[PDB]
Amino acid sequence: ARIGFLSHADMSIHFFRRPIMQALKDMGHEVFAIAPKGNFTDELAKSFHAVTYELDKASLNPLTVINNSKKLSQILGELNLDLLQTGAHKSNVFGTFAAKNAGIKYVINLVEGLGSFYIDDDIKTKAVRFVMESLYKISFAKADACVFVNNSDADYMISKNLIDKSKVYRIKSVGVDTAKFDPAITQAVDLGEKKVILMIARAMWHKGVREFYEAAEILNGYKNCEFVFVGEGFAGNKSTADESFLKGGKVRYLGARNDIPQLLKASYLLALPSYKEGFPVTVLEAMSMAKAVVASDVTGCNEAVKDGYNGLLCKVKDANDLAGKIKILLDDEELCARLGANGRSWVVSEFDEKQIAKRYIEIYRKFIDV
Numbered sequence: 410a411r412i413g414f415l416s417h418a419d420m421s422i423h424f425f426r427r428p429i430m431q432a433l434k435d436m437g438h439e440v441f442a443i444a445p446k447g448n449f450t451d452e453l454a455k456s457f458h459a460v461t462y463e464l465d466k467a468s469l470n471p472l473t474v475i476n477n478s479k480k481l482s483q484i485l486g487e488l489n490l491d492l493l494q495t496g497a498h499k500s501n502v503f504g505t506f507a508a509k510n511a512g513i514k515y516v517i518n519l520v521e522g523l524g525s526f527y528i529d530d531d532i533k534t535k536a537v538r539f540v541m542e543s544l545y546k547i548s549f550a551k552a553d554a555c556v557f558v559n560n561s562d563a564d565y566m567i568s569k570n571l572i573d574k575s576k577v578y579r580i581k582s583v584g585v586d587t588a589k590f591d592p593a594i595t596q597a598v599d600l601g602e603k604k605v606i607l608m609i610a611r612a613m614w615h616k617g618v619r620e621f622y623e624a625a626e627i628l629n630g631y632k633n634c635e636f637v638f639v640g641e642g643f644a645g646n647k648s649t650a651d652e653s654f655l656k657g658g659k660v661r662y663l664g665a666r667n668d669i670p671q672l673l674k675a676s677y678l679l680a681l682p683s684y685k686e687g688f689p690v691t692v693l694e695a696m697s698m699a700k701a702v703v704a705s706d707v708t709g710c711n712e713a714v715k716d717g718y719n720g721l722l723c724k725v726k727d728a729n730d731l732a733g734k735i736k737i738l739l740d741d742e743e744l745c746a747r748l749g750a751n752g753r754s755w756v757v758s759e760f761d762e763k764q765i766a767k768r769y770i771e772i773y774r775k776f777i778d779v
């Protein structure tokens with residue numbers, strides 16, 4: 410009944426792990442949110458036991474990653490956890506080494522997208538991918554189970570003999586609060602009298618930001634549409650567009666936001682031209698808002714979006730095709746509503762966060778008493 414949730418980022422605890430954690434709290438367990446300090450740490454402390462720690466998130470310096478993870482082992486050791494849920498690569502691998510060195514008996518892993526080491530193909534990145542995969546064989550072997558939020562990541566990692574089918578659990582998506590993300594109780598943000606083409610994302614190039622801005626250029630307000638981008642960029646990051654790029658195109662830039670339901674209600678459709686995903690949550694949120702989606706035909710996107718059912722798929726790294734799919738929906742309002750209505754019907758039946766959370770807890774029940 411002492412259950413930790415380790416992440417590299419408090420965003421993942423607050424946005425993804427939370428419904429699991431709430432369900433365990435409501436059952437009378439002690440739930441720990443273990444993540445570096447961030448914008449959500451203080452409110453999370455009110456609900457759960459916040460634990461912070463230092464991390465060079467993107468660094469691959471060996472002695473930095475040894476020291477980071479040794480300190481981490483001590484922080485985890487002092488919590489006296491019965492089970493630790495990790496998520497994403499650094500916590501799955503090094504969080505597991507540190508968890509076992511700290512004497513934690515049960516470690517559950519979680520893969521939610523394979524990330525940029527499978528987008529890039531430069532030799533340096535092909536070597537990094539090899540090492541991480543070889544480390545994963547050890548870390549998975551030490552952990553008791555791994556949850557996958559899509560099928561392609563599980564299939565892939567099984568095919569590389571990184572983990573036995575026995576330990577793979579497929580829980581599709583991290584779920585969405587369909588009662589909060591409900592159009593009937595949501596008041597739209599006012600963005601004018603325009604057909605809003607909404608993209609929600611951290612401004613990673615690997616998220617398709619450039620293609621989205623190029624497509625805005627191509628359509629240039631066709632049928633009174635307006636491209637709108639929600640999310641943060643960063644300065645001096647090669648992996649990221651800066652605010653000067655995000656403010657300099659035919660896109661209305663809103664920066665970070667907390668009224669996503671309200672923004673989705675004001676939108677005509679949601680675009681996600683990502684290069685690679687796990688099970689994109691902005692897609693789930695758009696679906697719960699009964700909004701059609703236009704998404705790249707890539708990993709993750711093509712499991713959350715079924716072409717012709719709840720959205721349309723476009724080629725990746727292709728602004729013209731992205732624009733083309735958007736124009737088809739701008740040209741055909743009845744189709745766009747039908748797809749969004751199917752999107753709503755699907756989230757409600759398969760992706761509500763409450764049933765998703767219950768299925769994580771059944772995995773834990775195999776190992777500890779809940």
Ligand SMILES: CC(=O)N[C@H]1[C@@H](OP(=O)(O)OP(=O)(O)OC[C@H]2O[C@@H](n3ccc(=O)[nH]c3=O)[C@H](O)[C@@H]2O)O[C@H](CO)[C@H](O)[C@@H]1O
Pocket residue numbers: 424425521522523524558582583609610611639640641664665666667669685686687688689690691692694709
């Ligand atoms: C591999 C990858 O590229 N992405 C995956 C990764 O996290 P990502 O962080 O890439 O997931 P994402 O970008 O889909 O996260 C979106 C979440 O952030 C929220 N938001 C975003 C912008 C903003 O200004 N305000 C705001 O509140 C939004 O409401 C939603 O809850 O893990 C997720 C959880 O399973 C999904 O699998 C994604 O597919």
